[PDB]
């Protein structure tokens, strides 16, 4: 399982490249969905079966669901921003791209110089993650439950409606 | 010499399923001649997401249920107690009822 | 490793804070009351402080691979707990004139206090990551609690996006140092290397990305650009909390990481933090010069004070008193920022709706509330490294640590930054005594008043007599 | 190039293709079976008619996700069936994550409804898609816990270990709460009759099946039914005895139990009326989720009590 | 079979592309999308690091990463909904009322 890993990585890079430089956001979210699927295939190819199954269960089955839910909810197509077309102008495109590409070349120079023992087999199943999830790492999942509770409280308090109606036209400053 | 055959069977199953759907679609094609929805839908999607990520800890607990003793049961019990406290808080505030 | 019944004693403040979290949440569900929930949160934090005393009665041990509890952890847990208590006592009068729900604030403050306690106890990379995220994420709804207002919503947006970016940076750096060293523990980050091999590329780059994330979380240069907007937009108790407790816990876990890991002997991370501390002190004192708003000025002052903490941290492997100096300066900075932001919170109480602009206008503060002006100018003296205050004791400890290990550039930076800082510090101190061009009977407003005047008496007493603070800091010594 | 390993591999490929064709024709045939229970060549005639009809792409829509929503609705819950073992030597997937994979497929099932709702350039179809997607999220949240009851009883995720742990006692009787929660979640996610068409409370909401004509509608028409037959297969292989029987062959037993459970689904089609939307969401959030969490805690205490 | 360098380079490339899409784009929704790209890249790097040494800590850090991603996505989407309901636009350069 090495050529599958390489092709999944290549189409993941391609899919997120089409994510970054797209115009309408629902197609970009679809490209991110297939990118998450490819990274899940990468996770499967490295013996992390739980990680890839989790990516499609959680990251592609719940998080992209939230993104498309918001997009399909408030009805953006990117209106008044597609016609501007700021990201497909070059004087904004060279700067951050070559800066973050300098970051890319320096961090992959930092990647090299480490001994290569290779990715081994022995796929770590969910049983090992379970036995090391409630052994040494108990407080991790307890306070992660507390953290998820805090995130739910924050986002519910910030983003509720305060108005009655299952169809609402947009008023400025909520009437 | 059996798991390779199983992986091959999985591969041909997936490939021929998408190929069957593609050929079915193109055989159907060939022949013949400012508003806003709501905020409670986003809220229920967020409830689904948060409780699914807590369900992930329950997912990983369910595989190692026997190898972890009663102390792991106690830790998962207080985890589930925190989960149910959050759920009953959501029930009692009124953010979970629909009332259309 | 398993957790023994006697290991539950060292876990007690975290369990008490979690129990008061679920008790407060059940009280919100059952009744939705403000005073009862605030009293429950205060009682839970006080019981956590008595539990910290009970921990001090017990031993200091490694509870799990995630957490090791010792005197350093006890000191930072106590500081975070009393900062959260101060945040609640400053937030009740602000929430008294609030139109929407006013109990999720206490819930998020309690959860962020739990995150600060986890960071105080963090002996692990996963524990560090979870602690800073448990600090960051309740603060999103704390900053955007007054999301009806424009500026609080903008500050919440900026804080959320930049904290997500810095969390990604920290996570990638932690992944790099896990790829380099095959153990996620603090003490085993360079144990597989030796004989001058310690300056390896992958470990150094991962620690650089971790430095980027923690420099966002400690308002260092040039990751400090979130500081004034977040301080200004957030409510004043939120500014108090994310100035004192969050930054105290993040610097505590940074000090524990740089003490326990053997990368403190590396002469590249030390130089990078020397440059960062130099630029942080100099830049923050420079942009705090021409400031009229008090919250932005306090944010730049915080940038300078984490710069002073960073120069106190550079000499950790040589000065032998850097942990004590950092603890004393953090006690002084905590009390001084607590008093200043308490004056800011009490004068900006209640909320008075989102339509009215929440400008401070500290000029003429003495002519209608003299005690608040007195404690505010005491904290303004304390933040400048001026004597008869505890901030001078902290500055003296920082300068002694910097000059013990011969950090001449950093000592000169501290001197120049303090000389620049006292300009606007005493400018605010004078301006709160001038004549006002234009221009309270409740029990909890009085409670905030006695809290800030107790902070003023504490900094005055420990400025004229710092010896009990030195005794209780040196008694709390981490296990080497 | 005649080698017995290649012969065995090609026989496994033949097993995969015959199980795919048999599940497809099972769904297609008992579509007509349900329509009679509410002439097997009538579906062949319908397929000929649907093949000889033009697919309409709306001029206000796009030619990618409008056709990709029925793609998801068919193939996601089609490859959900690859997990199911019908016999010890007639299985196509023996991978370790034998329950998480069905969770992946059920999580991706909402994409079809959402993409169809946007693809139909119609506000009412979008609102109906929002209602249906909210319902299926609100039930697939605890679908996982309903499966984790049996997973915790049987130890691992592998369905072979599940059906070998069903040797002494089937999991239906110790866990009836898990059985009813999984039945409810599978009814709601696959859009079965009681948790179906949530447009009944608003006339500003319309279905996502509208503006789908010909093959793109037939993909949904066969995809929901392939989904209900693979949900029935999941149900029998988890809670009932997978391929387990005294005398008749194991695949005959599997077919008999699957047929029994979709005649039970026909009984569901006949008996209960459709509840209101608020009642459906309130049920799925307040009753089902604490009950399955309590079921997981109870089966944890049970399996840790008699562990000797 | 697979060197660590290729997997870490893939994760680094994803992190670079996510940071680039976070910087160069004015839309807040696309900024959150890029943030989740960097979170997934760091999680992928942790998964490769855990799979190289054979330990299960990489997958646990992946679980913590996706829990943070879920909660942060919920918070960012609630903030995006509030920004749309108040400002009626999603230009991140528009909400810049705080000058130095």
Swiss-Prot record, chain E:
A GO MF annotation of the entry reads: NADH:ubiquinone reductase (non-electrogenic) activity
Job description of the protein: NDH-1 shuttles electrons from NADH, via FMN and iron-sulfur (Fe-S) centers, to quinones in the respiratory chain. The immediate electron acceptor for the enzyme in this species is believed to be ubiquinone. Couples the redox reaction to proton translocation (for every two electrons transferred, four hydrogen ions are translocated across the cytoplasmic membrane), and thus conserves the redox energy in a proton gradient.
Q: Which residues cross the membrane?
A: 4-24, 28-48, 60-80
Q: State the UniProt keywords alphabetically.
A: Cell inner membrane, Cell membrane, Membrane, NAD, Quinone, Translocase, Transmembrane, Transmembrane helix, Transport, Ubiquinone
Its organism's taxonomic lineage begins at: Bacteria, Pseudomonadati, Pseudomonadota, Gammaproteobacteria, Enterobacterales
Which PANTHER family does the entry link to? NADH-UBIQUINONE OXIDOREDUCTASE CHAIN 4L, NADH-UBIQUINONE OXIDOREDUCTASE SUBUNIT ND4L
Q: List the disulfide bonds.
A: none
From the Swiss-Prot or TrEMBL record, state where the protein is found: Cell inner membrane
- State the name under which the record lists this protein: NADH-quinone oxidoreductase subunit K
Which EC number(s) does the record attach to this protein?
7.1.1.-
Report the enzyme's class at the first EC level: translocase
Among InterPro entries, the record links this protein to: NADH_UbQ_OxRdtase_chain4L/K, NUOK/Mnh_C1-like
What does the similarity note say?
Belongs to the complex I subunit 4L family.
Give the organism, scientific name. Escherichia coli (strain B / BL21-DE3)
Q: Which GO terms describe its cellular component?
A: NADH dehydrogenase complex; plasma membrane
Under Pfam families, the record lists: Oxidored_q2
A Gene Ontology biological process in which this protein takes part is: ATP synthesis coupled electron transport
- Membrane topology qualifier: Multi-pass membrane protein
Enzymatic reactions = a quinone + NADH + 5 H(+)(in) = a quinol + NAD(+) + 4 H(+)(out)
* UniProt gene name: nuoK
Q: How does it assemble?
A: NDH-1 is composed of 13 different subunits. Subunits NuoA, H, J, K, L, M, N constitute the membrane sector of the complex.
Q: What is its main location?
A: membrane
């Amino acid at each position: 399982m090495e050529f599958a890993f390489y092709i999944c990585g290549l189409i993941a890079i391609l899919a997120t490249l089409r994510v970054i430089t797209h115009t309408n956001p629902v197609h970009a979210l679809l490209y991110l969905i297939i990118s998450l699927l490819a990274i899940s295939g990468v996770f499967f190819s490295l013996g992390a079966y739980f990680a890839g199954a989790l990516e499609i269960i959680v990251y592609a089955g719940a998080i992209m669901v939230l993104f498309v839910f918001v997009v399909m909810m408030l009805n953006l197509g990117g209106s008044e921003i597609e016609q501007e077309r700021q990201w497909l102008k070059p004087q904004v495109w060279i700067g951050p791209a070559i800066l973050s590409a300098i970051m890319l070349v320096v961090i992959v120079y930092a990647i090299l110089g480490v001994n290569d023992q290779g990715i081994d087999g022995t796929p770590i199943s969910a049983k090992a993650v379970g036995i090391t999830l409630f052994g040494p790492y108990v407080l991790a999942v307890e306070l992660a439950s507390m953290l998820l509770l805090a995130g739910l409280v924050v986002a519910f308090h910030v983003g509720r409606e305060e108005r009655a109606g299952e169809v609402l036209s947009n008023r400025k400053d909520d009437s | 010499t059996e798991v390779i055959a199983h992986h091959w069977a999985f591969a041909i199953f997936l490939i021929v399923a998408i190929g069957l759907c593609c050929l079915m679609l193109v055989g159907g094609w060939f022949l013949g001649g400012r508003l806003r929805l709501s905020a409670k839908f986003y809220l229920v999607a967020m409830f689904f997401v948060i409780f699914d990520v807590e369900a992930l800890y329950l997912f990983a607990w369910s595989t190692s249920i026997r190898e972890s003793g009663w102390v792991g049961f106690v830790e998962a019990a207080i985890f589930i107690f925190v989960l149910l406290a959050g759920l009953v808080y959501l029930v009692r505030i009124g953010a979970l009822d629909w009332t259309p | 490793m398993t957790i023994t019944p006697q290991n539950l004693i060292a876990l007690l403040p975290l369990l008490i804070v979690g129990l008061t979290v679920v008790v407060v949440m059940l009280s919100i569900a059952w009744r939705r009351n403000h005073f009862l929930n605030a009293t429950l949160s205060v009682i839970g934090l006080n019981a956590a402080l008595v539990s910290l005393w009970f921990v001090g009665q017990a031993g200091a041990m490694d509870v799990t691979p995630l957490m090791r509890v010792d005197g350093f952890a006890m000191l930072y847990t106590g500081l975070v707990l009393l900062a959260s208590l101060a945040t609640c006592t400053f937030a009740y009068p602000w929430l008294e004139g609030y139109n929407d729900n006013k109990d999720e604030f206490y819930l998020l403050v309690l959860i962020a206090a739990l995150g600060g306690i986890l960071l105080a106890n963090a002996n692990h990379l996963a524990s560090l990551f979870l602690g800073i995220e448990l600090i960051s994420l309740p603060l999103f709804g704390l900053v955007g609690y007054a999301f009806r207002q424009k500026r609080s919503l903008e500050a919440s947006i900026k804080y959320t996006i930049l904290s997500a970016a810095a969390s990604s940076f920290l996570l990638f750096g932690m992944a790099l140092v896990y790829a380099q060293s095959g153990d996620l523990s603090f003490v085993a980050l360079g144990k597989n290397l030796g004989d001058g091999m310690l300056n390896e590329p992958l470990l150094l780059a991962g620690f650089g990305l971790m430095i980027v994330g923690l420099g966002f979380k400690l308002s260092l240069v040039p990751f400090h650009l979130w500081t004034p907007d977040v301080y200004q937009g957030a409510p004043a108790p939120v500014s108090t909390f994310l100035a004192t407790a969050s930054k105290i816990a993040i610097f505590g876990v940074v000090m524990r990481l740089f003490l326990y890991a053997p990368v403190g002997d590396s002469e590249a991370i030390r130089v990078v933090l020397a440059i960062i501390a130099f630029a942080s002190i100099i830049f923050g004192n420079l942009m705090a010069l021409s400031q009229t708003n008090i919250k932005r000025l306090l944010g730049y002052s915080s940038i300078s004070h984490l710069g002073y903490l960073l120069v106190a941290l550079i000499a950790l492997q040589t000065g032998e008193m850097s942990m004590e100096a950092v603890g004393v300066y953090l006690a002084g900075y905590l009390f001084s920022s607590l008093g200043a932001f308490g004056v800011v919170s009490l004068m900006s109480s209640p909320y008075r709706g989102p339509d009215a602009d929440s400008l401070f206008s500290y000029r003429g503060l003495f002519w209608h509330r003299p005690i608040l002006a007195a404690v505010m100018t005491v904290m303004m003296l304390s933040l400048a490294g001026i004597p008869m205050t505890l901030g001078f004791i902290g500055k003296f400890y920082v300068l002694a640590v910097g000059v013990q290990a011969h950090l001449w550039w950093l000592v000169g930076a501290v001197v120049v930054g303090s000389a620049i800082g006292l300009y606007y510090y005493l400018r605010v101190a004078v301006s709160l005594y001038l004549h006002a061009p234009e221009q309270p009977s409740n029990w909890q407003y009085s409670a905030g008043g006695i809290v800030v005047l107790i902070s003023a008496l504490l900094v005055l007493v420990l400025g004229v007599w710092p010896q009990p603070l030195i005794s209780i800091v040196r008694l709390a010594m981490p296990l080497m | 190039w005649i080698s017995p390993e290649l012969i065995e591999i090609l026989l496994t490929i033949l097993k995969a293709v015959v199980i795919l064709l048999v599940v497809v024709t099972c769904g297609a045939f008992m579509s007509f079976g349900e329509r009679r229970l509410l002439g097997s060549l009538q579906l062949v005639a319908d397929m000929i008619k649907m093949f000889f009809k033009e697919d309409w792409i709306p001029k206000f829509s796009d030619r990618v996700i409008f056709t990709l929503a029925p793609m998801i609705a068919f193939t996601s819950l089609l490859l959900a069936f690859a997990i199911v073992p019908v016999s010890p030597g007639w299985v196509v997937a023996d991978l370790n994550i034998g329950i998480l994979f069905f969770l992946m497929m059920a999580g991706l099932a909402v994409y079809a409804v959402l993409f169809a709702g946007w693809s139909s350039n119609n506000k009412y179809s979008l609102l109906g898609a929002m209602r249906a997607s909210a319902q299926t999220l609100s039930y697939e949240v605890f679908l996982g816990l309903s499966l984790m009851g049996v997973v915790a009883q049987a130890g691992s995720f592998n369905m072979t270990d599940i059906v070998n742990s069903q040797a002494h006692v089937w999991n239906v009787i110790p866990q009836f709460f898990g059985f009813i929660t999984f039945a409810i979640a599978g009814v709601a996610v696959c859009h079965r009759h009681p948790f179906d068409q949530p447009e009944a409370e608003q006339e500003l909401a319309d279905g996502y099946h509208i503006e789908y004509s010909g093959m793109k509608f037939g993909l949904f028409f066969v995809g929901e039914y392939i989904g209900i037959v693979t949900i029935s297969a999941l149900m029998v292989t988890l809670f009932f005895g997978g391929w387990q029987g005294p005398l008749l062959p194991p695949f005959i037993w599997f077919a008999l139990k699957t047929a029994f459970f979709m005649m039970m689904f026909i009984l569901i089609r006949a008996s209960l009326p459709r509840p209101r939307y608020d009642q459906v969401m309130s049920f799925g959030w307040k009753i089902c989720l604490p009950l399955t969490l309590i079921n997981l805690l109870v089966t944890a205490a049970v399996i840790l009590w008699q562990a000797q | 079979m697979i060197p660590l360098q290729h997997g870490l380079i893939l994760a680094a490339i994803l992190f670079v592309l996510g940071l680039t899409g976070l910087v160069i784009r004015r839309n807040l929704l696309f900024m959150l999308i890029g943030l989740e790209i960097m979170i997934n890249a760091s999680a992928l790097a942790f998964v490769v690091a855990g799979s190289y040494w054979g330990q299960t800590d990489g997958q646990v850090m992946y679980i913590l990463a996706i829990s943070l991603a879920a909660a942060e996505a919920s918070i960012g989407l609630a903030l995006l909904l509030q920004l749309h309901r108040r400002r009626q636009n999603l230009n991140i350069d528009s909400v810049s009322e705080m000058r130095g």
